[PDB]
RNA sequence: AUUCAGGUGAUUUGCUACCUUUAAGUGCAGCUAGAA
RNA sequence: AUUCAGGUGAUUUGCUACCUUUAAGUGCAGCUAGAA
RNA sequence: AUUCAGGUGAUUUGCUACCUUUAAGUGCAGCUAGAA
């Protein structure tokens, strides 16, 4: 999996749709906000989850909660890296969709938390696409609530380019 | 697995024909004698274990033995918390067998050990079955001796109400 | 697998055809050379590998490397037993073969390591016939040189006899 | 005797794990404490 | 209540693993630093 | 940004494991040392 961002306008056709989609841009962001890589794939559907930095309930969030995918350093729990928003992950359109330059990143203290939180991901890449596929079996069901809408989502997100 | 008490009738009965069958009642026994629920279901036989309090030689008996499982608190090893008696389990029938009335005994230390007992009980459930499985070949092949007489037991047991 | 030694003839015999075959005798050398029990056995082909000392080079060689297998005491890493040496295993005929008779060795330190040895290489069986397998494979597929000669050895070995 | 097989990580120092049936990057250290 | 089943290690003290679906010696200690 | 999905344990607070393909209760704490 990998880092993007995507088009404000794309996030803004989503948020005519679903205001709790993602916000892309924001005053207070210092980097752009960053979304991990095919989190899930399905029906050809492509969706992409949110990259979140620590708040403070993110302490009774528990592991085996479908909302978040907490992160942290490999073997060192007390690292908490953020999470993953499952709970909030949007279907993309390829050609909105961005991969971060990592290859041209300055080596800064950003750029190096993105490597740590990548290589956990990279080990985790299973219980997250299994996370992300049961949270929208979920959701669709009607069991669970609070989320993006996917059904919705899905149905709107490629009238984009009109 | 569960635990149960046996009817001193049908435990009588067993004893005419192996001394090994587990005694039943005895005066200095403050709850009943109390069996593991079905540790072993083969041929159409049911199997129960006798439960039995820490003796001095237990500290012989290693874990591999075929003789005993050793119980103990889970995760908490130098809680001994007694064996069960594989070497004399018995075949039953569903209708001398009783399951102990748990959802109602008082709270007392005696209730609270049988938790601490059924769980690691729980979470051992197989290596029990498995050697119980095992206990019982070796017994019928010839190649174990001091044990309760499984293949005449068999014979014997359901021939009990007559 | 068991420590072997090897006729000097038929050593003899297979360095007419390849120079890479482990060297049999030496001046230099206390106890005979020995020979690793059946590395690998494939067509019909029984191959037994050289065992060496340490060398200064053995700490560069990385544990996914083919070319050996690196000994040591069971649990004790820094205990470095020399190592086998696979790019260089020969095919046999179990009749210029011969088992050590460690049953009637005298107990010395030669004899002591030789049984740290054995353990270890008993408890990696898997690993080491896994790693000759394909370290074969990829000498036979044209993929990996400096080894000995086993497509040239496995043709004229079995003609030793004449 | 025969003096480091080639790969798997948007990064990868040490070891370890895995791939070479054409596929594969885990784990424990170290380093880091970044912020959406 | 009923006082420790045998075995698998070219070697193996304690425990453990494992085998007794015809099979099975792993791991931790302990001892060992040995040489091709 | 967007402030804890419900389950699996004759019992289970905290965490965790597992299940959510109709399935699934593990492990670490803590509590506890009961008796056949
Ligand atoms: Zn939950
Ligand atoms: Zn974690
Ligand atoms: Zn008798
Ligand atoms: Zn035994
Ligand atoms: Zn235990
Ligand atoms: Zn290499
Ligand atoms: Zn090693
Ligand atoms: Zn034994
Ligand atoms: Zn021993
Ligand atoms: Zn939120
Ligand atoms: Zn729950
Ligand atoms: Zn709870």
């Known amino acids: 999996m990998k880092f993007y961002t995507i088009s404000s306008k794309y996030i803004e056709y989503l948020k005519e749709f679903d205001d709790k989609v993602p916000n892309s841009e924001d005053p207070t962001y210092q980097n752009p906000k960053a979304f991990i890589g095919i989190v899930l794939e399905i029906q050809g559907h492509k969706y992409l989850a949110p990259l979140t930095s620590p708040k403070k309930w993110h302490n009774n969030v528990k592991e085996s909660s479908l909302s978040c995918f907490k992160l942290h350093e490999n073997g060192v729990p007390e690292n908490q890296l953020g999470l993953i928003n499952l709970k909030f992950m949007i279907p993309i359109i390829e050609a909105e969709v961005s991969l971060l330059d990592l ?25 997250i696409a299994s996370k992300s596929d049961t949270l929208r079996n979920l959701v669709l069901q009607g069991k669970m609530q609070g989320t993006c809408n996917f059904s919705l989502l899905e149905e709107k997100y490629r009238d984009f380019g009109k």
């Open 103 to 127: 290859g041209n990143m300055p080596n800064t203290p950003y750029k190096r938390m993105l490597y740590k939180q990548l290589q956990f991901i990279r080990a985790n890449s299973d219980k």
